[PDB]
Every structure is written in C-alpha cells, then in structure tokens.
Predict the 3D structure of the following.
Amino acid sequence: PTLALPGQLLGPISKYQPGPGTHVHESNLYSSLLGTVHVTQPELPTISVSAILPEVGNIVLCRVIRITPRQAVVTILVCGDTVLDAEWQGLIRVQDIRATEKDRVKVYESFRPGDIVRAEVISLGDQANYYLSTARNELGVILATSEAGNTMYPVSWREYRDPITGLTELRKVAKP
Amino acid sequence: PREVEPSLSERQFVLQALQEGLRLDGRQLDQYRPLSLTFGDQYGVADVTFGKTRVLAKASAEVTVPYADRPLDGIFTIATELSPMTSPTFEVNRPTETEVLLSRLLEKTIRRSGALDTESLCLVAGQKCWSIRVDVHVMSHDGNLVDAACIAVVAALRHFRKPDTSIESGVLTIYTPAEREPVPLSWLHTPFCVTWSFFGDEGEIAVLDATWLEEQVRVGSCTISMNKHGEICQIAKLGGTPVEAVSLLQCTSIALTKVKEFSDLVDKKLAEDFKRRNP
Amino acid sequence: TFPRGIFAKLSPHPYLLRTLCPDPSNSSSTPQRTNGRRPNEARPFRVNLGSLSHAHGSALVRAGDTTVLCGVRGEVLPVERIPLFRQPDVGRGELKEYDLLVPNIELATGSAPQFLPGVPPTALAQTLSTRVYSLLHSTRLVSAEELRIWYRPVQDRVVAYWVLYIDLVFLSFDGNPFDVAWAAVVAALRDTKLPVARWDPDREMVVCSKTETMKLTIKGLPIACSAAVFLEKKNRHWILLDPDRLEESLCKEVITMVVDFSDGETRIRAIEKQGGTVFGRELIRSFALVAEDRWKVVKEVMK
Amino acid sequence: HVLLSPAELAYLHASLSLTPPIRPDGRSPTQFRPLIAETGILPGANGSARVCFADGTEAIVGVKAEVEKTTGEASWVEITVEIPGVRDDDSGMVFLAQLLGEALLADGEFVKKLWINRRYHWKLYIDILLISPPLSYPLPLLSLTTHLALLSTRLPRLKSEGDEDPYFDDDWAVAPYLFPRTRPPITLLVMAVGNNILFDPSKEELAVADVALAVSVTATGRKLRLLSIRTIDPPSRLTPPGVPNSSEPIEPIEGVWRAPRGGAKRLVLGALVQKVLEKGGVVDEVLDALEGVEL
Amino acid sequence: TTTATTAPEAALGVLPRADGSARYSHAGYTVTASVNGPIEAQRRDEHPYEAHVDVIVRPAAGVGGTRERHLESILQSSFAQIILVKSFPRSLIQIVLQVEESPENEYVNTKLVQASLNFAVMPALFQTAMLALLSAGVPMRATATATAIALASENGATKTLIDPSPRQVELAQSVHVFAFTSQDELLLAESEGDFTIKEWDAAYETAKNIPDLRHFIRSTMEAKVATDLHWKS
Amino acid sequence: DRRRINGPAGATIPPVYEDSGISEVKALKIRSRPSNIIRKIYLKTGVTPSASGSAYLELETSANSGVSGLKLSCTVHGPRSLPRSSPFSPHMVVSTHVKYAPFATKQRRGYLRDPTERDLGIHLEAALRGAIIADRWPKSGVDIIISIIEGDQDREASKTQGDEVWDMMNTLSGCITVASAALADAGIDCVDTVAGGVAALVQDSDGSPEIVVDPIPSEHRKILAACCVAYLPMRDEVTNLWFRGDLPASDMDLYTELVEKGIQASRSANRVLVDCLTETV
Amino acid sequence: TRPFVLPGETIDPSLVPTHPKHPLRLGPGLRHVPPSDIIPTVAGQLITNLNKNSMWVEYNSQRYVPTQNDLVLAQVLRSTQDSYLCLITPHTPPATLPHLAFESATKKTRPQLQPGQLVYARVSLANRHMDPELECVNPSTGKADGLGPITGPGCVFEVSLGFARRLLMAKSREEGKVGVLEMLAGEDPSIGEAGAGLAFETAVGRNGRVWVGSEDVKTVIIVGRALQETDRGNLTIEGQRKLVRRLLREMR
C-alpha cells in the first residue's frame, strides 16, 4: 500500500531486484512510476510499482481488419485479460492459423474482417506489426458475425452457424 | 494516388500510330478536337469542351484591401485546384505536378500578356482594389488542360462584368447589380495557349492537341501563348526530350494559325451570347 | 461472457445494446447506457465565466468529460479598412458584409484519441465553425448596432467596427461537441465586456478607455440540444441525449435542435438531423419538447 | 539525425570516458578542427562570409542592411537559416534560427548599433545558407560564419543628419564597420562524457554525448561575457540500445552501449560553462583563429 | 435552367471519363456531379466493414471554405445511409459535386469566402448526387430526393417558397431542407431561422407531398436506361 | 485558409488605450513576493480523461488570489503505435507539441505560427526526453501536447514589456512542470519527476542586482539575466538548462548562484508537483 | 416489355420466378433479404430467365466489380517475389496474378511479364473482403484456353460494361446487336466499301477493356473508333453500319 513517486528511492540493488515500474541508478533502485509498491519476495526479492505492451507468448484478443490470401492483419485489443489503451496491428500468417495441414488452410476459411480472434503472440515483428498464431485449440475466432450481420455461434470447430439466417460459415473456432 | 499508366501495348501502339501519322482519334497531328465554348447564364461563366475534355471556368470580382505583392495595386488571381472529378488520381488539398504547372502557365499567360488593365481595377490606392478571381474547374480531363483552361479563362474574363463603382465626395460607392448594371471588364488583347507534344525518341514527331493517353506517351511538350496579332505571351518547353529549334519554330508558326481561329471563335461566341442578352 | 471491461472494448455495440436494453430476465434493470446515464438523460452543464483574463469575454463550459473554453477577444476594424462599407442609415447587413463575428473551433490536439497528432485530420472542426457561424448570424444573437464605433462630433460617422474573434478550444472532447460549443459561445458572448471606444480626431484613431466597458446586448438565449439514435437493428431504437464520444461512434444518426424559450413559447432556431431515417416528423416534434427541457435546465446554469 | 551502431557507440563512449579523453580524431579536448573561411565572399552584401570545416560542411552568410522607418533599440534584425532539403519549418532549422538571434539580441547593444537616427533604423537581414548537406550539427559552423559575416559587415556612412531622412555616402570603402575593430557573439557546441568536457565535437562524438550545450559568448585573455546557454538534446538519447552477450540492466556492463538515461549531473553543467569562460580558454583560441581571418 | 422554370432539367453521363455523372439544374441552380465506383480507399478511410463515402463539394466560385466542409458532411452522412456501403468493405466512393450556377443575388456584392450555411444549394447538390449515383450504378438501399422550403413572412401571413433563390433565403424568416427517402422516410432535416415546431411540420408536409421530384428521378432514369438498353429489344 | 473562418479582409487593430492620464499610471509594479518564493502553483491531474494522462496548471499573475496568469493544459498520450511511415524506432519516441490557444495567440489572425511555439516544443522535448525512459517501450511513441491556454501577460502587450524571452522562460517552466504531472498521470516510466524552475538576476535600483526566483519582467526595472532549468531533485540532474543575459565571465559566481536558485525554484515547483500527484493517488 | 425498377423498389413476388427444383440465381443489381424479398440495388430493367430460374437487373455502368470466373484484360502493375500484381480496372485495388498461373509455367519456364504488360486472364477468386486473384491456366487442365499475356501488336479500348457484355455473349450480333466487328471484318455483306474486310483479332474483358490487335495500324484505329463510338452512341445495328461506312472513308 506504499505510494511511490517517479524517482523515489526504493532501496539498494543488494536488497531488491528491479521489477516492472523500477529502474536502477548508481547501484540504487528507484520507482519509475507513480504507483503502489509491491515486493514479490520469491536470489533477491523482486520489487515493482503499479500505476502495457504485448509480449511474446501472451494470449491476446484482437479484431480482424483485413485479410490477404497470405496473412490476416488484426488490431490487438486485449493482452492477458487487460484492455490496451492504445492498439497495435498484428499479422496472422497463413502458416500460423492451423496446427496441421498448414498448406491446405486458407485465410478466407479461417477469419474474416470484423470478427474477434484470440491469438498467441509469436514474435515482435519487423516494421509496425506483431506476429500472432492462432494454431492452438484455445486460439481462434471468439466472436463472429455472419455476412448477414447476425451474431453467430460455433456449430463445430470448422464453422460458425447463424441463429437467424441459419447459414454456416467456415472459420477457425477457438475450442473452449 | 499515383497516376494510372497505359499498358506498354497502348504505349507502343500510340507511338507506332504517330510514326504512321495516325492518331487513335482520327485527327491529323496538327488538328484540334471539336471545340465547344458555352457561356453560362451568369456573367463571367464560360464552359469549354475539347471533345472529352471539359473545363468550366467562372470569373468573379470582389473589392478587397490591397496587401503583400500588390499592397496598393489591384490583383487578378487564377485558381485551378484539380479534384477527383478531374480524375480519382487527384486528391483535394493535394497539389500535383500537373496542377502546379497548369496554374503557373495560366497566370503567366494572363498577367504577362497584359490583357487586363490592373490600374483600372484599383478603386482606391492602398485601401480598396478590385480583385479579379477566375476559378477553373476541370470537369473532365482528357488531355490538354492547359489549352482548354486558357480558352475558358479568357472567355470567362471577357464575358465577366464588374459591379459598377463611383467616387463621390471621396466616398467609394460600390453598386450591387440591382443598383446598377455591371460594367464589362476592360480587355486589351486575348492570349491563347497552344500545347504541342513530342513523341519520337528524338522528339521528331509533333502533335498539336494530345489526348490524355497521348500525354502519357509523349516524351516532351511545349506550351505557346500568343495574341491574335502574333505576339507570344509565353513559351514553356519545361524540359523533356530536346526538339530541334526548327521544329519549335514550325510549332509556333502553326500555333499562330490555331490562335487566330480561337480568337475568331471567342469573338463570335461572345457576340452570339451578347445578342441573347440584348436581342 | 467476457469481463465487462473486455466486453466494452470488443463488440462495443452489443455491450451498449445490453445496457440500453434492460435484460429481459431482470424487472429491476432499466434502460441505461455504458455511462450509466439514461437514454433520455443529458449531462449536467458547468459554466465558469471570466476564465481567461486577457479575453474581453470568456467561459469554461464543462459537460461531463467534454470541456470547451471559449474566449471572445474584440478588435477594432476601421471602416477605411472595410471593403463594401457604407455609412448606415441609422446587403447582408454589417455582421455578414464585414465579417464582424469570426468564430473558430479548435479540436485541440489530443483532446480525444481521434484528434491525436498522427491521426489524419477530420472536417469536424470546420463543420462546427460554420455551424456556429451560421447559427450565430441567423439567431441574430449579436446586433451590429452594438459593434459600431461612432465619432459624433460637436456629421456623425461610423469610424470602425468591433470584430469579435470568438475562439473555442476543446480542452476535452467526450462527444456532443456542438451543444457544449454553442453554450460556450453564448455564455462567453453574454460575458463579453468590450472597452468603451471612441474616435480620437487628434490621433485620428480609435482609442479605448482603460476602465469603462460596454457589455454586449445579447438578445435571446438559443440553447442547442442534441441526441443520437442507437439501433438494435422490431428495429428497437433508443434516443440518446448528449451522445458520449463512444456513443457517437456507434450511432450513425444524430439530431441537433437549437431552441429559444425566452418568449415562453419554444422557438426552434435550427434543426440538423442526418445519418439515418429513424427520426421522423413524430420524433422531431417530440424532440422539440426534449430540447425545451434542455433549455430550461441550461438556462439555470447560464445565469 | 546521425546514425551509428550500438557497438560503434559503445567504443566512442568508452574512449571519451577515459581520464584523458581519446577522441576519435586524436584531437585534444580543448582543440578545434582546422578552419577555412572567406569574408566579403558575396559582393553587394553589406557583410558576407563563407566557412568550411575539415568535416566537409560549408555555410555562407550574407548581411543586407535596409533603411527602415522606425540609442533607440528594437529587434529589427531578422535571421533566416536556409538548410537544403528541409520543409522550412523543421525543429532543427527553427531552433537554430532562434538560437543565433538569441545570441545577438542577448545584450541588445547590437540592436543599438543598427539605429540610424530616432526616426529611422537599420533593419538588418541575416541570411544563413548551409551550402553542404547537414552531415553534422550545423550550429558551430553557422555561428562562426555569422561572427565572420558581422565582422565583415560595413554600414553606409550617413552624410545626412537624423531628423531629415538619412542619406549615406556610397563608397563601401568609406562605410565604417559594424562591430568595428564588443565582438559579434561566438557560440561553441560544448559536450560532456563522464567528467570530460569536449569542444567542437564531431558528429560521431556528439552522438555519445552525455551532455551538450550551445554556449554563446562574446568579448570586449579577452574580457569574455556570457550571453546564453541552451541544452542540445543529446542525440545519444535517440540511439539504439546495446545487446549484451549471453529487461532492466542492474550493472553498467563494460562495452555495452546504453543511451544516457537521465539528465546532466548538476556539477557537470558548472564544469561545462566554467571551462568555456576560463580566460585563455577555448573561446580565446576560437577568437584568435577567427580574428586572424582577413576582412 | 433559370429560377422561373418549374421543371427540373437533368442529364446523365454528362462527364464521360467518370464512372457515373449527372448535370442537374433546377430553380436557377446547376450542379454537375461525378461519382467514382468503389475504388482503392486511401488507407486513412479504409473501414474494415463498409465502403467509405467521400462527398466533395466545389463552389461555382472561390475556394471551398468551411461551408462546403459542412455540405460534404451533410451529404456524406446521408448518402452513406443510402448507399449499400456494406457491399464494398474496403473500397471508396468518390462523389464530387461542382456547383456550375446559382441564382445571382442582384442585391448583394459578390462575396466568395462566406462561411454561412447555404440551405439554398443543398437540394440541388443532393439531387445531382442522387442522379450521379444512379448513373454510376452504385448499389443503394433506396433513392432520395431533397427539397428546400423558405418560410417567408409577408404582412400578416406566412408564405412558403419552394426551392428558393439564395436572395429569398436570406430574406426568409426561416429556411428548411428535407431529404425524403424513396420509402418516404426523412433523411435530412437541416433548418435555420426562428420557427415554431408547427411551422416546421407544416413545411415538412409541403416538401413531402408535393414538381414531383420522385417522378422526375424515375422518368429521367427510365429514359437513360431505355436509351442504352434499346438493344435488348 | 480553407480550414478556418477568415476574419474581415482588412487587418484588424488590437484595442489601443486612451492613456488619458500619465499620473494615473503612477508607480511601477514591485515584487512583493520574497526573492526565493515561487508563484502559487495550482496543479490538477486527470483533467482530460480521454487521454492516457493529463494535467492542468494555473498560476496567479502576481501572487494575487483570483488574478490568474499562466494557464497550461497538458495531455500526454500513452505509448501508442508509431505511424507506419516510420514504423520502427528502437527507443520510445517522445513527441512534444506546444500550441498557444487561439485566445493566447500573438495574432488573432496569423500568417505564420509563432516561432515561440516551435521553440518551446524543442525545449520541452529536451527536458522531458531526459526524464522519460525510452528503453522501456521500444517500437512505440508517446506524444505530450501542451495547450498554452493563457500567458502570464497578453501577447501583444508583452512586446512592450522589454522582451518576450522572459515570458517564454516562465512559460517553459510551467510546461515542464505540467508535462511531468501528465507523464506521471499517464504512468510513463520517468527517471524522476522533472519540474521547471526559473530564476533571474535583476536590478531595480542603483544597488547591486538580486537573484530572484520565478520572476515577471513587469515587476523589475531591468532583468540582467535569467535561467530556466528542468531539474530532477532525486537525480540532482538537469535535463534542460536555458540561460540568457549579458554576464561578465568575472561574474561566474553570479551565474552559478543564478542556476542554483533556478534549481531551487525547480525544487519548489517539484514540491507542488509531488503534492498534487500524491493526493491524486 | 421489361419493368423498370429504381433501387429499393421491392420486386413483387408475382414477377419473381419460383422453381422448386432450383434456388433463384440472382444476378447483378438484385439483393436478397431473409424475409424472402428481392430488392433491386441499381436502376435498370428487371430480367427473368425461367429456363434457369434466374433473375437480375440489366443496366449499364463503367467501373467493373471483379467477379469470379470472369475473363478480364488486366494490365500488370508490378512483380512481387511470387505473383505479378495486375490492375483489372484503373483505380480498382490491384489483383494478384500468381507467377505460376500460366500454361506450362514453372520457376524456370515462367513468362517474364513486365510492368504495364497487358494480360488476358480469368478472375480466379473474388470476395467482398479479399482482393481478386487472376489466372491464365484452367486449373483443371493446365491449358491456357486462350488466356495469357497479350503479345501481338494492338491497343486497348475502354467501353461500357454493358457494351462489353454485348460483345462477349455468344449471339453478339443477333442478340447483342453489336455487328461492328462483323462489318469491319467484311462478314456483314452489303456494307459497301467493304474492301474485302479488315483483319484483326479482338479480346473483350468483362472489365470494359477490349484489346484489338492487327499488323495494320489503321485497322486497329478504325475498329477501336468503331467500338468506342457505337458504345458511347448506343447505335442501332444500322447506325453501326452508317458509322463504319463513315469510318472506312476516313480510313482512306
């Protein structure tokens, strides 16, 4: 519950290990943020400050904005159940959509713009994009809306079905 | 966005046809497209059509305080901002190499030609001067905008009428059309632009009025502005592949002939409109 | 489903629809937006006149998160510098012939995410400026009689006109800009106290008293009311008064209604419906009552 | 602006961090690079000067004095900085334009010189051209050219009195000097790495500067007078980070570059300006070399 | 063409290069509109779901000031409600409107920079844009027609002026612009000046139940289609 | 411009006062505030919730309650994806935009944006960039926007008051403080809070000049020199030093004192800054 | 005659073809809604073909909307590491032409097309979401079937999409009423001044581009003018004969 200001001294590096929200300076550890201090106390105790960026291995929820026979470009909205105040573009390469038959899968059969995808960050990418892979049971489309504009439901892992228009659509369903 | 290009088939063929002395439009190399000049109901509106190229131009006069380049002088301006209507390639508030040269050639032509009496424009010195703005609207771009615009601009300015004015006890009175009949804008001589295009890799083939497709294939061009009396108001062969001086003199010699018929048309068309106004 | 925060970011329209439609399961639930404000509930205005020391008039108008600061700075325009000027008999009138009112809206960079420096510019600033400009003139809010500066020797002449540079800055933008912006303009103009100015024939220029000030004779109190339609599309439609930034992104259809009730009879000074067809003649007739209610509450703020 | 690799930067920082700073040029910390300059380069300009560094950058400055309708002093002088390829509004260009003007208008004596009479004042136009592409931070060279230019500036002698509109002899050889032989302000881009203070830094050196100051000075060693200081945002801050061999670093690892993460230590600022103003210091060296140029 | 003529006059394919185009003149106002069919949207306006509609308005004289920026927004919002923008998700639709003529107000000197809303010209712009969209074959949910009513007051009576001249607009006590969709729904309702809700509703009736623009749009479009489908036989 | 409602064609004149009595002008303002005491800083945080972090700063003109002078609104925008024309940067790119509010603009109609606005951006950019950890957020950018709502003196009036530069230093000092408040609000990793201190060497009599913290030129007959300092008390570091004034090199001690008091002003301002941030959370 | 319909004018179910065996194959200009109503999206004349249980709105327009299996005369804009981008229409988003989409094409034997190279290709794939893809092979056979880059000497002429469909329908002269090509080829007798017919090969894209090639420049110009002037003129078949008669005299 201790409130710390930017630049406030937290302790020497010999006592604590720098965590998020902290920075070292002349063998001393300071808080880089206005926020509450927290010590992990696991080696030395990690110390951090709480008042965010996507990171490899994180599970993110994103909105598909454009699809290309090669890659589908998505906007990252949530990282680890945390909404992001600012957004980042990510690419789901066709190789990264499915766990198997990566040659057979097509982007058009996986996601289409407007739907919400839960994906795993594969790498910080060159230029402006992250690289995200949905090739996992827990990853794929979460919210889908048919061409008719109705909110769909996942009839099977391969396709979503429409409750009002009845039509099915091929998309990369997330298993849970 | 960036201009669309013809396919290399079109590029090669157009060049091939010109070497045969033939054009896709059926016109000779030294021939213009059918010229239609229409005057709007309002004074100062002129609507020029060179086949598929249409350029609406409207003249306007507003009394304004004089500052900067003409601090006490009275100033005539030309605005020719192209719009997607011209072609989707063009974008609003985004001048282009085509637009900048088009505006540059027009303003130089009208100003350097001394067509307007600028001293006549200033109602008062350093306080109020008539500002003659002519707005050029390229309704459709099928090549040779510089030429179509010039006819529309001069047609509009000659068709345009100033509001009448009077100085009384030193008081400048500017009369709305309801108060007084607008007075025609004084006009000494009418310059007209002619835009040749050159296609041969040595510039040996000269074409008088280029279609948009031809303008994409030409290796150079040369705009010439002249009076009916042969006075050249400007020449602008702003680079491109070089052309033998004899060819350019041939181009100017021909251009004078085309200018004469343009001048006759505008004079005739203005007379025809005048009768509609005063039968 | 998702945690409410996540559900708000992705699929915002369904999330709002859920708040705006009290869930069928709960009788207790009542229609309400993501703000918790009801569809028929506007945001409370707060007006702090005299906020800017230099300005001849000013107001800091806060409507929820939206925050407009309006500053009216008067400058003198000699007639000798006015094309088309004529001595009045005591045309479009002096206000329009001479451009004596110069309103300009600044959607200050960063006032909202959509106005970030890197985001492409949008016309919203221009549209509001002209919306204010036309409404400012059509309402006849300011009379050129007040802006004239006379010589009156002891052969009367108008020697210059006061030019009101009505500058607005959206310190915070949370949707529904015109209502706040117009309120700031009216509030600031009511507060405007121009210095008493006179013609100095010896200096041959207009000079102003360092202490004496004349207040603008603002006539009427046109108050702008706005709303947006949210569609489930039975095509249920919810009318949202004072649409929040988020709500504007979802409601394609918006209505603006400027009414004056100083006569005790609502007089509609301007209407601006667009973006949809839900607002028929019936709703617009109904909305005139809503605007009158909005006028009554705002009247109590812009004392 | 300038681009260097972190490993390249790490070497530069380490070399300059040593107790005797081993500058890449082998130059002494107090030592300027060779100076090549010309005066009255442009005829028909009241003052003009050209300067070219061993770095290859060059700049030309011309001074036009125009009689304008107004001991009296107002900021009549205007400075323009023509950099090739800039939008005419860039941060660097405008920052320089204000900085040089700040130096001259710092004392306001210079404004006084341009006062023909109570009725009329010399409006002085300073146009600064960076002939070379901006390979390195222009400020040092531009300041030295402006110093040389102003020194070369001659002002038309006034045959007419003051209440009447001023009338001036036409001979340029008769016209007396502006700043006739206080001096026009010099400005030195001073740099610090660790405790070492460096003068006339190369773009490579300036790229690793922990602190960078634009110090404007004048003379009347010489009787120096400080006129202004401005902190040049160390370009080192915009450089890439170093990657150690096999997150927050706990230690300043040797040989691993890391952008200077804070500000300038309070004492270093005193040291940077103290060494600039020490009598017989760099300023005297610069003025000695500068004043040796023919005029 | 001029203000005195009751009959609207229109043409389609006026500008050949454009995808669709139309030249429309009524009550003294002439506007020529060019529509470009879904094309590459500049990344700025590449919406993921629907085509971006980009209305551009160019005045007969002077540069397009704030006034035009408003007209573009007014028409952009309304036509986006008319066009089936969902059919071209990432595309763009250009609608450039060029005001060729408006009744010259004989009682005012020319002012080009005026920034006041010009309801006077809104119907002509809307009609021409509607014709151009029909000419371009852009898919649409419905056609739409706009009308301008100026509620002049003379002596003790209020006088409705339909499609008024700008001089009438400035003299009018209030001016109204209604744009009714083919379904008879209201699409735009821009109004200004002092007026009671009763007066507005009365104008709503005048603009909605009346020259039959619905018929004019259909008749002119019939002629165009009948002309170019004459081959069908 | 196309984008703004242009005023009248003629050039409008700002009000010129009658100036009927010289006697009425009477005495020249004298600094009642102690030489080591800054103005009363009013600082608020979270004034623009739409932004990632924001703050508002306001000062009394001459330490008089209700007589507001400088007014600054700052809206830090949180690390956000960099534009794609320059899609990569190893270090977080601090971008500073400073604009006088139209009410605060030198000209109600201006052909050119004030050089002063660009200059303040560079100074503030240098000050904040030193205090912000760029390494933390690679491939991202953060934009600090300062809206100078009101200047401590009217722009056209400042021309008469000796020099605008002194006002600019006052403005910059505020910008540093408010921007730091916004940065702390936005949760941007900062090495230390940076506050903007300003101090001046002044001579209001024939006696020796005084060092004065947080000056205003109207209160002094002659400002010999002034210094603006972006200072980090927890680091004892200066991220942006700005000094102007003719000082003999023999007066190096005075300069040293002038900087130290300028740093003292920064400490004083930082006191308010931490108090506002502490109470904010 | 066919009923003319404006957009939004719902088709009366009496006019709607209904066939239990086949679902209604809606063509251009019509939109279906779940309520089972058929709404025209464009102004035109309603067409019904009970033999196919098909219905659509006939109309003429310029900008082509890529549709799968259409044959289009795309022009290559650029080459990427694996496909050649081609612009089907002048501002339409560039289509993708895979490098190996040509008969007998391999990484070794691929034809080296160049920027601006004209190519006659089928629309392999088209969706409202993705940009269209092109192909020259018939994937089920690998044969070109007349597709591929346009190598011969010739030029491309733009025409209205409706006119392009008239050329491409099998009964172009009888049903399409476009006899210009036959008249210039000399196949239409009694034209007068026939000159035994000109020699040319023409390929007509669904996108309104018609490439006409011939060793004779005059031939290409004449046929190009004929197609464009009959398209823009909506000329009757006799009007076409009058046109080519006029052109062939100018050709002299």
Summary: DSSP finds seven helices and ten strands in chain D. The first helix of chain D runs from residue 6 to 17. The helical segments of chain D are 6-17, 91-105, 109-113, 139-152, 203-206, 266-277, 282-291.
